[PDB]
Amino acid sequence: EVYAPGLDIESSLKQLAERRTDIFGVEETAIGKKIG
Amino acid sequence: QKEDMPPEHVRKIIRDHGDMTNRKFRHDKRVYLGALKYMPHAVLKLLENMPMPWEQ
């Protein structure tokens, strides 16, 4: 299929959550904050 | 503590680094560039310290 497998989707979502801390992580530090 | 220095060595330095188009002051690299970040600030001083008419 065109879309990536489930593992790749999970990794991408985890990376997005780790980077964008506005709606993920313990605290909302910044949009591009490495650590929330 | 640090003190002042005679203007002769400053004149020697500026004469040596008169133009950067040659291979003279090319080694400066980042060190040279660093100062450039604060180039406009000095201009402010040169527009604030400029002499009044009485200041010959």
Place this chain on the structure above:
Amino acid sequence: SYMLPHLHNGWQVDQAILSEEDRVVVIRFGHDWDPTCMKMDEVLYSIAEKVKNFAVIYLVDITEVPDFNKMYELYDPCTVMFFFRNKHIMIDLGTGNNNKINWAMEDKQEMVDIIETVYRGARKGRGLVVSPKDYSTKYRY
């Protein structure tokens, strides 16, 4: 939700673009966490199902692959480079930089028309091609 394939390594994107045949490789540079880039990724996902026959979308992260940031001057969000047929195409749409689309398309149909025009131009062999819709104005009024 950004489920399109993404280049984990920079060299992987290079060989992925190289491994193309009669298809257009839309490499979308940027970051998924950006909101405008998120909108662009959503638009690309919407397009992907309809034009998967000849248009393949393959995202990449600037932080993950910074070696290509200076290659094509990647210093804006939402940038898109239609690197097709191993040749960086010249897509002109009434903009100063006629080789980079660095903002999310307002409508999906416009992007589909653009990508099919790019495919036609690439197949014809020309390295440059114009857009039916000029983007010099945003039609704000």
Place this chain on the structure above:
Amino acid sequence: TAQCFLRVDDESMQRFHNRVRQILMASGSTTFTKIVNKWNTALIGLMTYFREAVV
């Protein structure tokens, strides 16, 4: 015995301006002749409706 001073209604003027906005909106790929003819029709309609109020 009495004089009637008349003017285009605010609702009518707003509707005409919205029509002009709609005409200018569908200008992404429409022909120039189509756009100018739409303007001609709109202006002619407004004038033929209330020339006195337009003046």
Place this chain on the structure above:
Amino acid sequence: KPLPAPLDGQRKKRGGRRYRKMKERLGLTEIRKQANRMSFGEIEEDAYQE
């Protein structure tokens, strides 16, 4: 249902009578009768007759 790939148009290899029959059945014969030519001089209709 992916959209078809817009391949470059290929003309008919050999124009056949059956192909001509389809051309006779479907085509722009009636449209060609209506001439779109416009005289350089002004027409009797108004500016926005439409």
Place this chain on the structure above:
Amino acid sequence: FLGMPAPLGYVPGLGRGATGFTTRSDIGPAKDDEEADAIYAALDKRMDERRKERREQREKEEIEKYRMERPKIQQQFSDLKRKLAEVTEEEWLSIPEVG
């Protein structure tokens, strides 16, 4: 070719054979140097530290005030994701793939 390792020892920019897209000058960048960069960064940090504390405190207070009015997206269903794991393994296993 997603999921493949990148063979090292080759420059991706040069191996692909690309041309420098010089869009416009002064738009791209185009040890003693390291020590100078560190010194200049330290000077910049010293200059910036004149107002850092009060600005950070005010920003934190404003963010805390904003959170009360509207929290993060995952906050509106924190209870749901807490109770999400209560579903049996065989439940999501037989999820209808059809739509």
Place this chain on the structure above:
RNA sequence: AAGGUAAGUAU
């Protein structure tokens, strides 16, 4: 400031 690089072809 700009919104004004034709592409192609081997050197």
